[PDB]
């Protein structure tokens, strides 16, 4: 796909020089992004592979300073 091409062209040309501070970089914001996605429907666990889904809705009460963190990143 196109976005795949962008990612690949943007890493292949930069991974030729940077080899110590790249995967640490792009893989870091993800820990915050997961804290921004509202739940509409869920999966549950009971015993090691049990599931029991829930139609529970849950919002995402994210504070403001983590946006500043993400922006710095």
């Amino acid at each position: 796909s196109h976005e795949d091409y962008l990612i690949a062209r943007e890493l292949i040309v930069l991974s030729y020089s940077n080899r110590s501070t790249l995967a640490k970089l792009v893989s870091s914001p993800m820990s915050i992004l997961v804290a921004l996605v509202d739940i509409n429907g869920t999966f549950i666990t009971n015993e090691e592979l049990e599931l029991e889904f829930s139609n529970k809705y849950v919002r995402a009460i994210v504070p403001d300073q983590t946006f500043d963190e993400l922006k710095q990143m």
Partner: protein
């Protein structure tokens, strides 16, 4: 598809509280000259009331459309509260450095103070007009300068502004009585609220439309919406017994061939969790939404037939759909019950008025099973109104689960029988299948009590009355999801958190409030259209707006017939007080607004008689008339519906006196030479040739010293006489003092929209959680 509906529901923001920054105005003062009688002009000028935004169309139908649009505008401005200090401004000429309510009021006061041509009394009055306060009452009194219609609207918005004093008691009283009186919950708050505070109450008036009366396609959507919402608040079954530590107990009870686990000898099919929670959720959400649920089972699986008993007992039968439970009852009777007494198999008929349990209750002679089936057949809901809302309630024996004891009585009897007609393996299979339920007895009792408790607890958080009506579409319920629930359950109580309850209650409140509010909107516009005689208006797009503002329907695929029936129902609803009063302030002043607006005229008189002109003073001499008496009148909108230019043509060819009625443009002519030449009589010949009456523009003969031929009047002793006067009123004269009013308001209150955020709520430890009977639930072991 499913998740989307809840996304739509939970994105219903409440009705945003309104607060205006200025005052409703239609009129404004304006300096015109004044022409002393005989026509000539004073050095002095004078103020008059004129209209802001003269935009009135031609023709009467179009004018009534204009006033309907004005009614919509005034409704959209129609606020919920206001604090006059927030719009107040200084007066640049006040003795006491006072204030006045509006910026435009101040502009008026500061323009009249400057004019040469104002008495000293008005300047004194302007120096002495100021604000006042009385803080013991939190009240303020500001001056204002307002046309009477404008004062009427503003004063109505003052006296009829919707707020209510907020306190710490109303917060509690906003919660249902059941939650407050349910000992499993503990409530508090960390704030005291002053008497300076306020709050607005929702409109929770029940369905004025009876959508459960032959709007089944809409009721299906409503009930589905409430079902899926209720699924989001039923608790998950946090703790169960494991799914493999059960199946080995079942297998040894059944003494099955090894590695039949992957074949699942029909007793053992669909035992998993992900179904027990599904059934627990489906049953409750369906009973809450009152949505019918159909059963998809198999007859090879006898545990499904056995676990259908608990279901058909704890749940009413009018709650299901008929053919499904007919199949299930038939199966139960044919392979668990009648073979246990040597009865014939059965002979059931497809289209039979009676269900198998009815026709079985009378045949067999055993007390236990007979009375169990009696309970099943005559189990049904109990309607009861509580906290205003109708509710479908259970028996009070299902709740404190003892029905299961009658069930055990029947099942134990059937264990004790023999199956003479049938072999030994069959009896063995059935009796083991029901021992697996006998061994779960106490857990079944606990389950029944837990469902009943959670059901009533969530019923508490309902605002719209809950009717018991079958529906087009159903909700499937596989009986393996019952067998699982009846077999995977134990020592694990689940109480809905208070926050889920408050969420569900506020959601339902907001939906109900939106519903009532939009109903009132549509009813207002419909009633207004009917009272303004708007007959060309097709009342569909209004109902489209009504359904769009209800964010669950698809108007793209709903027809016109439902809309018109819905309209027919909406016709018969009373308009709320606000909208009705605002409309009756327009019906009594729409004409007085229409007498103004020097772009149209209310008619033209044609009287072939050298009549006199009138000594007005904003004009000089004019061909104006203000009564329309004497001559007979002809309405033009009648003439433009049914083109019959026979009457009027007869009357024009024969020079007969007449009046023509309807909003007509006009054009001023300040030439005296156009008066003696009699040009105004030249306009009505285009009505006989091209029979249209649209390009009809009578003349107004305003004469004065500013006319360049006025000298004749002042040299020759002739009052301006003329023909074909015009039917029109004069502007009103601006009296500063009489135009002044004092507007009252409250001083510095604070409006709190959300109402439960101040409430903090907690649950007792669910081991020691209790039902209505002051007796613990989940206690059997």
């Amino acid at each position: 598809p499913k998740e989307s509906i809840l996304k739509k529901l939970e994105d219903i923001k409440p009705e945003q509280v309104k607060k205006q920054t200025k005052l409703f105005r239609i009129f404004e003062p304006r300096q015109l000259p004044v022409y002393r009688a005989n026509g000539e002009k004073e050095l002095r000028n004078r103020w008059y009331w004129k209209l802001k935004r003269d935009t009135l169309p031609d023709g009467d139908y179009d004018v009534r459309e204009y006033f309907l649009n004005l009614y919509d505008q005034v409704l959209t401005e129609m606020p919920d509260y206001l604090l006059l200090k927030d719009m107040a401004v200084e007066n640049k000429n006040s003795r006491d450095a006072g204030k006045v309510v509006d910026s435009e009021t101040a502009a008026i006061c500061d323009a009249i103070f400057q004019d040469e041509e104002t008495e000293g009394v008005v300047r004194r009055f302007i120096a002495e007009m100021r604000q006042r306060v009385q803080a013991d009452r939190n009240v303020v009194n500001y001056p204002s300068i307002l046309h009477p219609i404008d004062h009427a609207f503003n004063e109505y918005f003052l006296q009829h502004q919707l707020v209510e004093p907020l306190n710490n008691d109303i917060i509690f009283n906003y919660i249902p009585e059941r939650i407050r009186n349910d000992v499993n919950y503990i409530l508090n708050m960390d704030r005291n609220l002053p008497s300076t505070a306020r709050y607005i109450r929702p409109n929770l008036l029940q369905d004025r439309l009876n959508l459960h009366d032959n709007f089944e396609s809409l009721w299906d959507t409503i009930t589905t919406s409430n079902y899926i919402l209720a699924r989001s608040v039923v608790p998950d079954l946090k703790e169960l017994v494991s799914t493999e530590a059960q199946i080995q107990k079942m297998s040894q009870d059944l003494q099955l061939e090894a590695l039949t686990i992957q074949s699942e000898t029909q007793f053992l099919t669909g035992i998993n969790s992900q179904a027990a929670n599904d059934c627990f959720k489906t049953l409750i959400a369906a009973m809450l939404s009152q949505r019918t649920m159909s059963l998809d089972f198999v007859t090879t699986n006898y545990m499904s037939l056995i676990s259908g008993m608990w279901l058909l007992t704890v749940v009413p039968n009018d709650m299901f759909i008929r053919e499904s439970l007919v199949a299930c009852q038939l199966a139960i009777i044919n392979t668990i019950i009648y073979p246990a007494f040597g009865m014939q198999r059965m002979h059931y008929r497809n289209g039979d008025p009676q269900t198998p349990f009815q026709i079985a209750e009378q045949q067999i002679q055993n007390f236990q099973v007979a009375n169990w089936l009696h309970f099943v057949n005559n189990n049904q809901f109990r309607q009861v109104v509580i906290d205003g809302v109708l509710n479908q309630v259970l028996n009070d024996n299902i709740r404190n689960g003892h029905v299961v004891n009658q069930l055990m009585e029947a099942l134990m009897q059937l264990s004790r029988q023999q199956f003479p007609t049938m072999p030994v393996d069959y009896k063995r299979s059935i009796q083991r299948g029901i021992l697996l339920l006998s061994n779960r007895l106490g857990q079944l009792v606990d389950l029944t009590r837990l469902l009943a408790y959670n059901y009533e607890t969530l019923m508490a958080c309902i605002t719209m009355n809950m009717q018991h009506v079958q529906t087009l579409t159903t909700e499937k319920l596989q009986l393996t999801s019952v067998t699982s629930l009846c077999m995977l359950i134990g020592n694990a109580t689940v109480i809905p958190s208070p926050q889920t309850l408050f969420h569900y209650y506020n959601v339902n409140v907001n939906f109900h409030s939106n519903y009532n509010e939009r109903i009132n909107d549509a009813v207002a516009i419909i009633t207004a259209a009917n009272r303004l005689n708007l007959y060309q208006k097709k009342m569909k797009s209004i109902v489209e707006d009504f359904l769009k503002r209800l964010q669950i329907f698809d108007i793209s695929r709903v027809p016109d017939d439902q809309m018109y029936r819905l309209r027919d129902r909406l016709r018969l609803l009373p308009v709320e007080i606000r909208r009705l009063d605002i409309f009756n302030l327009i019906l009594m002043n729409m004409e007085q607004i229409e007498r103004a607006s020097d772009k149209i005229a209310q008619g033209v008189i044609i009287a072939y008689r050298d009549m006199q002109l009138e000594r007005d003073e904003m004009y000089g001499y004019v061909n104006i008339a203000r009564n329309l008496d004497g001559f007979q009148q002809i309405n033009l909108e009648e003439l433009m519906r049914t083109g019959d230019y026979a009457q009027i043509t007869n009357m024009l060819l024969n020079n007969q006196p007449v009046a023509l009625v309807g909003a007509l443009p006009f054009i001023t002519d300040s030439s005296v030479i156009s008066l003696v030449a009699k040009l105004d009589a030249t306009v009505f010949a285009q009505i006989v040739k091209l029979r249209k009456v649209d390009t009809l523009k009578p003349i107004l003969y305003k004469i004065n010293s500013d006319s360049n031929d006025f000298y004749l009047v002042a040299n020759y002793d002739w009052v301006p006489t003329s023909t074909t006067k015009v039917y029109k009123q004069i502007p009103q004269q601006f009296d500063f003092r009489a135009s002044m009013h004092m507007l009252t308001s409250n001083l510095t209150f604070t409006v709190y929209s959300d109402l439960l955020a101040f409430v903090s709520a907690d649950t007792v430890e669910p081991i020691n959680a209790v039902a209505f009977d002051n007796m613990r639930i989940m206690n059997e072991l």
